[PDB]
DNA sequence: ATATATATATATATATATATATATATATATATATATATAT
DNA sequence: ATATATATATATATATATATATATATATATATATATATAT
């Protein structure tokens, strides 16, 4: 029953060895050499792998994330102080305003990584620390094949891991009188004022050289002119074009 | 600049000033392509661990 | 192990919740069993949040709630208890009824002699307001079809051989009846504009 | 964070002093020894994490003496995690394996001798 | 002082007086609470002629008829119980969901609640016994009505958007297969009726 | 050695007996039965069907 | 022609879910004191 | 050999996050009355 046992669970190393007892000493050899030899091998394999796994694993990745959300919330605040040098109403200048993303994915993710980060202490030889990545690696596969669908997005995109908004500021006292277009309506053409300022001052801004108060370059392109808009946004934002020096056409 | 430029010379879509900021003003640098070798490479190491 | 509760109090406890309300004269055995073990009873029901009122002047026991004192739910809700909210008709029919039991009580004695009234004695006290329905049978179809549901109730009997109804005890035992006054005051002041 | 390596180095500066052997064979009230091994924070566990799981290898393999360990609670830890705190020598014969010298031995002879001879 | 209960355990048998089942799935808070006290929660429904029944690999707390020193004679006739007496089709279409809810139990294992099938699973089965009559929504109509009171009796959910509905674990014991052997004895005392 | 490279194949019936010369009778049971049903015949009409 | 059943309207009460505010616990920063090592 | 300089360990305070309680909105179930259709 024994041998016969050992030959069903056998991936194949028994495949020759029979069922009487002048075949034990086959399966003797067997036990003895994958107790000695193959097991241990296979351990320091499997540990080895994990442990350059470890550094190279998705630690790097969260990191990377970090790091371009970081860089975004860097340049915001530049593109904003240069605002401060201008007004978008005779008594009024403007300002960026952001916010985080509540996407349950990334909370489910953080509390994996958290869990993950103790796993490693367990003494298991690696066991539960590969458990821990397995389930931490499924988040990342299930959102790549998904990249399309906004949680995903917002598991890898810097750009939605954050929301944005814009304050209407005092340029007397500095304070904030409103941060919502409460004037919004009509056939949607009074939107466009904020947008086109903030587009138009973000295409100043990065045409500045290092540390250039002005942009070198001056010419700007606005095809079909202003076709949604009405007549006196088309006045607002010509006022705007010339107040940051550009040259339209 | 010299491609947001380009960007700006058929804008025509306005529908939110968030939706404004990650289409034109930011950039993507989106890790799809690093999730999946990560993924890919930790499938090898499995292996060794069944 | 520990102890069964006596069959009796068991029974009447049973009794009264089924009922709501009961009379000695309707049934004394279990009147006096559970004025005998009212603590027995209030002990049953307090886990249920729930107690016994009872009134030895008029002859009833009937139940009440017991749950902690004045809660932010002074609109009191219970879970075991659903509760209503009876029509401007209803109300109406409650308001006859209640002036006409005040009346009868001094005129009758505090439940002395079960208070009762005529249908053909209700039927104009509704009339004032609401005026001929078409027909002495559309009127009586009326008043019985509402007196059915106070009966429901637990508020007033069927009409005896004389069609006099008789008025539980329990119409005295209601919560806030100035809502009811300012009910039939208005009730009042609205046919005297009205005629 | 101490690895045994210091700790074994400022045992060996104690030995140093020969006022210090002398009251540690004189004054047995000298033992058990111990020092401490350091003090973990969530500022170093949160981004030293192979770091710090090395170190507490590095500790989990030391045997001479004993060492103290308990589970330390980090915010970005799920659940405390053991942690090493003490190393503890309880006679004059854990010190002297702790310093290994074969200057070490003579004295340490030569005295528990001369305090006789 | 006062005998009154704890608060937590007013509230847990309240709900399950209310409701007269309790799923650990749905409202573990209550159902722990009852497992907790479930001596004290039979010493309150004992003055109630009433009994818990428990049945923990489905996590379910239900209320059933106890026996008084008379084994409620039929049990229905207790004063407390709201509803009517259980009948046939009713033990029909139980039996047919008793036995797709069995057939889910081995294929996936009993504490679990997914079982499901829709209107149109459902009709067929009973088709066999109830025959055609003559327009499907007609049939459709008696399922749904036979739904609403099993539902009342909480053996099944609401007929869903998909036409399906979901089999409660209660129906374990209700289909209790020694009642379920007792009724079959019944059903051969109504063959002799036939006879 | 038989009894044992039957259980190996098995699906359901022989989970519950062990393998030992008094187990055998469970054995040829499940053979009768799986002989009455003549199942295993119909299957080069089914492929058709 | 009448009575019963059913469907709909009014409508009210209850339960469930979600968001925000508050309270608490934990972690981190700063300052001070002490111990140890080095230099004279 | 003793003095002093520096490192680190500790205690307290305050800030931040997380958990929980409560308030409010919405959906559904009861529920009861009335009107209309159909059966005898
Ligand atoms: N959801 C809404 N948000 C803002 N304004 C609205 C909304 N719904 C209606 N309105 C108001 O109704 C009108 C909608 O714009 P309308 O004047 O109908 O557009 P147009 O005449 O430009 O086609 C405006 O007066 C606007 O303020």
Redesign the pocket.
Known sequence: KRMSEAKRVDTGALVEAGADLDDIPVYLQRLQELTEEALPEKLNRFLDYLNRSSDDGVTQLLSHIEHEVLVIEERLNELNETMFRVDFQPDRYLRLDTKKVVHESLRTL?KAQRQLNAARFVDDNGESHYKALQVLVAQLRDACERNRTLGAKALLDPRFRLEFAVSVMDRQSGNVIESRTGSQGGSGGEKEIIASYVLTASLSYALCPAGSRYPLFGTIILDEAFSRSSHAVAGRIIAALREFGLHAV | AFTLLNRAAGLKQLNSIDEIFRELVLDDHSAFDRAAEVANSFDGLTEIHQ | SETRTLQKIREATQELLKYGLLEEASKPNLYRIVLSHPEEVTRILEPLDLDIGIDEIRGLLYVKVRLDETP?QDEW???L?????L?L?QSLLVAILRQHFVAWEQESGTGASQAQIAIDDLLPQLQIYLGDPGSESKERTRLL?LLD?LKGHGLVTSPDAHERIVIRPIIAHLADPINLQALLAWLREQIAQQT | M?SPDELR??LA??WDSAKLRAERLLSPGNWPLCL?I??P???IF?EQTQRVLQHVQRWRQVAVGHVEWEAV???ASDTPVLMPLRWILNSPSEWINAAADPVVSREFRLLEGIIEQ
Do not use: C, D, L
């Open positions: 953080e | 932010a809700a219970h879970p208890v659903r509760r209503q909210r029509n008709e079809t549901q | 101490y180095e400022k500066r104690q401490p350091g003090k924070s969530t500022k949160a609670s980090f915010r």
